[PDB]
Amino acid sequence: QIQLVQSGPELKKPGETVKISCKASGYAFTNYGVNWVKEAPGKELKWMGWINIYTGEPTYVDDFKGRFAFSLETSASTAYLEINNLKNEDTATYFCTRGDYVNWYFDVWGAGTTVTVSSAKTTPPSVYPLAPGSAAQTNSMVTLGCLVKGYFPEPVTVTWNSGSLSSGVHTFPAVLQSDLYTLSSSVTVPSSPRPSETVTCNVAHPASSTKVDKKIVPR
Amino acid sequence: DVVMTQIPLSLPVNLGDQASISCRSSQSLIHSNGNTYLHWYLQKPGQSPKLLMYKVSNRFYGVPDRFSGSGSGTDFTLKISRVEAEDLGIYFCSQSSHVPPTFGGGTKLEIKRADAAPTVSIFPPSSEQLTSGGASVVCFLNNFYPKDINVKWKIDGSERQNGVLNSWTDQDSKDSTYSMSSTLTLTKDEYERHNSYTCEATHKTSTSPIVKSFNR
Ligand SMILES: C[C@]12CC[C@@H](O)C[C@H]1CC[C@@H]1[C@@H]2CC[C@]2(C)C(=O)CC[C@@H]12
């Protein structure tokens, strides 16, 4: 399985440093280039630079010169990218790709490494319930929700009735408001299931070791 | 940077049909010895890009026989012939004809479906977020297609702008719809210095906005 296999996710505060390994296996390592590509959140897939395994000298796009640096240990088939004085904009997934010398594409891609640069400290989420204040039947379906605000790191996990309810469940992407994250989930049940039957909102935050069950009570 | 551009951002496609994507270059792509290094990647969700077609018209090993390529110099187009369910993802196009290789924004294949309008639902703050101070009003503009919808937050007749942070869901694989939600995050004396709270959304389907409300 000719693959380039990369390190795991990195969570760094400002000013720190990270070193990403990219292990090449299955192919003649000297025979290609190793390129580093940055995929930033809803920004372009950006090319950082390149390493030529015959000479050993990198090449860098202006945009990542100075502070990003690429080292190599061609005996050990490992390529490297080092980031120093990690700024907050470096949160992105960095990928390494083997480029080819005759047809110049990039054909084997590593799975990407996620760095997350932030100043926050672990914080358990506050979980609040969303019941519809006698906001009557618009049409025989109540949608309740849960709102889990103020947490770091990602992830959280929302379930409703311990996974016994999943066809009406929408959980929305996290959006960090002031360092910490926010997220909400809605379930839509038939009006005879709730409020006769209970609907519970179960959120677990693995990083902090906190699981909160909230019951949605009529209002 | 040879600005690489692709339209459309999102291409609804009924599976079975045939999709065609296009890309364009802020320079020309014939290299200094008659070769054209325009290549296209497919990125399936939370996975890697992977070479599909190189040098404009050549298909990568294994890449399925309905994919095609064409274009000269500055307009290139990818064509898929009977798009099957796993041709779906973000299709990117790149150029390594000029230093440095650049990527275009990509165009996502999306399933097409008859339109619907958002089931909006509007939630006030809970006693328990209130006994400590914030108050996040939360509207859920759920189960609609097509993706563009816009929300406005009417506060006592007036409008509010700082406080909204919206968040969108990937096209639901069971009925191809989208869903979206905005929580207006006010403090407890911004919330208690007001009364009418209405959430409002104009989506392609109704000329009139599909407002909802509670009176503090
Ligand atoms: C286009 C460009 C772009 C960078 C430039 O310094 C060299 C040229 C030609 C060779 C290419 C290189 C990009 C990276 C490639 C594709 C490799 O990884 C090996 C051959 C390399």
Ordered structural domains, chain B, with CATH: 1-113 (2.60.40.10), 114-216 (2.60.40.10)
- Between CA A143 and CA A42 the distance in angstroms is 30
- B106 interaction partners in chain A (CB closer than 8 Å): 45
Chosen for mutation from A172, A194, A219 (greatest number of chain B CBs closer than 10 Å) is A172
> In Å, what is the CA distance from B183 to each residue of A47, A154, B134?
36, 19, 12
Place of tokens 């409703």: A160
Cα Rg, chain B, nearest whole Å:
23
Q: Is the dihedral angle over the CA atoms B48, B53, B54, B56 positive or is it negative?
A: negative
Alpha-carbon gap, residue B54 to A104, rounded angstroms: 9
CA distance B6 to B22: 6
Burial A82-121 (b: 16+ CB within 10 A, else e): ebeebeeebbbbbbbbbbbeeebbbbbbbebbebbbbebe
Contacts of B88 (CB under 8 A, 6+ apart): B44, B108, B109, B110, B111
List, in order, residues 6 or more apart from B127 with CB less than 8 Å away.
Answer: none
- One DSSP character per residue, B135-146 reads EEEEEEEEEEBS
Q: What are phi and psi of B54, to 5 degrees?
A: -125, 165
Structure tokens at A163: 């996974």
Longest dimension (CA), chain B: 72
Strands A10-12 and A113-117: parallel
CA angle A154, A155, A157 (to 5 degrees): 150
CB B154 within 8 A of CB B199: yes
Of B115, B89, B92, B79, the closest CA to residue B41 belongs to B92
Q: Quote the CA–CA distance of A8 and A5 in Å, as a whole number.
A: 10
CA A206 – CA B14 distance, rounded (Å):
39
Which residue is associated with the tokens 């790191």? Answer: A153
Cite the DSSP H helix spans in chain B: 127-130, 188-191
Q: Are A78 and A17 in contact (CB under 8 A)?
A: no
**Residue ranges matching CATH 2.60.40.10 in chain A:** 1-119, 120-218
How many Å lie between the centroid of ligand 1 and the Cα of residue A104? 6
Which residue's CA is the nearest one to ligand 1's atom 7?
A: B99
Token output for B40: 């296209």
Resolution reading in Å? 2.7
Considering the segment(s) A1-119 as one domain, its CATH architecture is: Sandwich (2.60)
φ, ψ (nearest 5 deg) of residue B31: -75, 165
Nearest to A148 by CA among A170, A180, A126: A126
- Please name the helix (run of DSSP H) or strand (run of DSSP E) that holds residue A215, with its range, or none: strand A210-215
Residues with CB under 6 A from ligand 1: A 33, 35, 50, 59, 99, 101, 104; B 96, 99-101
Let me know if A136 is exposed, middle or buried by CB neighbors in 10 A (0-12, 13-18, 19+): exposed
Beta strands in chain B (DSSP E): 4-7, 10-13, 19-25, 38-43, 51-54, 58-59, 67-72, 75-80, 90-95, 102-103, 107-111, 119-123, 134-144, 149-155, 158-160, 164-168, 178-187, 196-203, 212-215
Distance (angstroms) between ligand 1 centre and the Cα of B150 equals 43
Q: Ligand 1 center to residue B20 CA distance, Å?
A: 29
Residues of chain B positioned with their CB less than 8 A from the CB of A172: 167-169, 179-181
The method recorded for this entry reads X-ray
Chain A residue numbers touching B126 (CB-CB < 8 A):
128-131, 219
- Please name the helix (run of DSSP H) or strand (run of DSSP E) that holds residue A99, with its range, or none: strand A92-99
A55: how many CB neighbours lie within 10 A of its CB? 7
Q: Is the dihedral of CA B187, B120, B128, A171 positive or negative?
A: negative
Q: Which CATH architecture has domain A120-218?
A: Sandwich (2.60)
Q: Which residues, in sequence order, are bridge partners of residue B121?
A: B140
3 state SS of B173: coil
